[PDB]
From Swiss-Prot, chain A:
Top-level lineage group: Eukaryota
Modified residues (N6-succinyllysine): K48, K63
Localization: Mitochondrion; Mitochondrion inner membrane
Protein name stated in the entry: ATP synthase peripheral stalk subunit F6, mitochondrial
Positions where N6-acetyllysine occurs in the chain: K6, K10, K43, K48, K63
GO process annotations (BP): proton motive force-driven ATP synthesis
Species annotation: Bos taurus
UniProt keyword Transport present: yes
Taxonomic lineage of the native organism: Eukaryota, Metazoa, Chordata, Craniata, Vertebrata
Residues of the full protein shown: 36 to 101 of 108
GO molecular function, one term: proton transmembrane transporter activity
Described purpose of this protein according to its UniProt entry: Subunit F6, of the mitochondrial membrane ATP synthase complex (F(1)F(0) ATP synthase or Complex V) that produces ATP from ADP in the presence of a proton gradient across the membrane which is generated by electron transport complexes of the respiratory chain. ATP synthase complex consist of a soluble F(1) head domain - the catalytic core - and a membrane F(1) domain - the membrane proton channel. These two domains are linked by a central stalk rotating inside the F(1) region and a stationary peripheral stalk.
Quaternary structure, from the entry: Component of the ATP synthase complex composed at least of ATP5F1A/subunit alpha, ATP5F1B/subunit beta, ATP5MC1/subunit c (homooctomer), MT-ATP6/subunit a, MT-ATP8/subunit 8, ATP5ME/subunit e, ATP5MF/subunit f, ATP5MG/subunit g, ATP5MK/subunit k, ATP5MJ/subunit j, ATP5F1C/subunit gamma, ATP5F1D/subunit delta, ATP5F1E/subunit epsilon, ATP5PF/subunit F6, ATP5PB/subunit b, ATP5PD/subunit d, ATP5PO/subunit OSCP.
Keyword Acetylation: yes
GO CC terms: mitochondrial inner membrane; mitochondrion; proton-transporting ATP synthase complex
From Swiss-Prot, chain B:
Subunit: Component of the ATP synthase complex composed at least of ATP5F1A/subunit alpha, ATP5F1B/subunit beta, ATP5MC1/subunit c (homooctomer), MT-ATP6/subunit a, MT-ATP8/subunit 8, ATP5ME/subunit e, ATP5MF/subunit f, ATP5MG/subunit g, ATP5MK/subunit k, ATP5MJ/subunit j, ATP5F1C/subunit gamma, ATP5F1D/subunit delta, ATP5F1E/subunit epsilon, ATP5PF/subunit F6, ATP5PB/subunit b, ATP5PD/subunit d, ATP5PO/subunit OSCP.
Organism domain of life: Eukaryota
Protein name, as recorded: ATP synthase peripheral stalk subunit d, mitochondrial
Annotated disulfide bonds: none
Physiological role: Subunit d, of the mitochondrial membrane ATP synthase complex (F(1)F(0) ATP synthase or Complex V) that produces ATP from ADP in the presence of a proton gradient across the membrane which is generated by electron transport complexes of the respiratory chain. ATP synthase complex consist of a soluble F(1) head domain - the catalytic core - and a membrane F(1) domain - the membrane proton channel. These two domains are linked by a central stalk rotating inside the F(1) region and a stationary peripheral stalk.
Family (UniProt): Belongs to the ATPase d subunit family.
Endpoints of the signal sequence: none
Positions where N6-succinyllysine occurs in the chain: K14, K21, K31
N6-acetyllysine modification, residue list: K8, K14, K21, K31, K53
Annotated localization: Mitochondrion; Mitochondrion inner membrane
Length: 65, 60
């Protein structure tokens, strides 16, 4: 357990974090670094284009064997 | 409005159908008719005629 219940203490700390608006709370320069790193892996996965943009297309001529 | 931008752009983008710049066969055909067709057929007919003429005689 009855004492075990006193969840409360976790919430409060959830609360102060969530109540914070100025990026991700307690930055640390690493965040950007890691971010950028993963932002780079996705470039690898999805391609080197401007994903903000609609794509160009030049199509291949047909091929005969 | 990226999505709106894209849905629009997607539709009413008309993808080109490839030019058929490849039917030179029609030509290579008509050519081999000069060749196969007429020339052979003409000679074959003439040969079949004489053969027939040759069976003519032999009937008598």
């Amino acid at each position: 357990l009855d004492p075990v219940q006193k969840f409360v203490d976790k919430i409060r700390e959830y609360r102060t974090k969530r109540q914070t608006s100025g990026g991700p709370v307690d930055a640390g320069p690493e965040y950007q670094q890691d971010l950028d790193r993963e932002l780079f892996k996705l470039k690898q996965m999805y391609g080197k284009a401007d994903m903000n943009t609609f794509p160009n297309f030049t199509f291949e001529d047909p091929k005969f064997e | 409005g990226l999505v709106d931008d894209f849905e629009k752009k997607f539709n009413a983008l008309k993808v080109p159908i490839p030019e058929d710049k490849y039917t030179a066969q029609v030509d290579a055909e008509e050519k081999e008719d000069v060749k196969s067709c007429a020339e052979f057929l003409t000679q074959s007919k003439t040969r079949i005629q004489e053969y027939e003429k040759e069976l003519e005689k032999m009937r008598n």
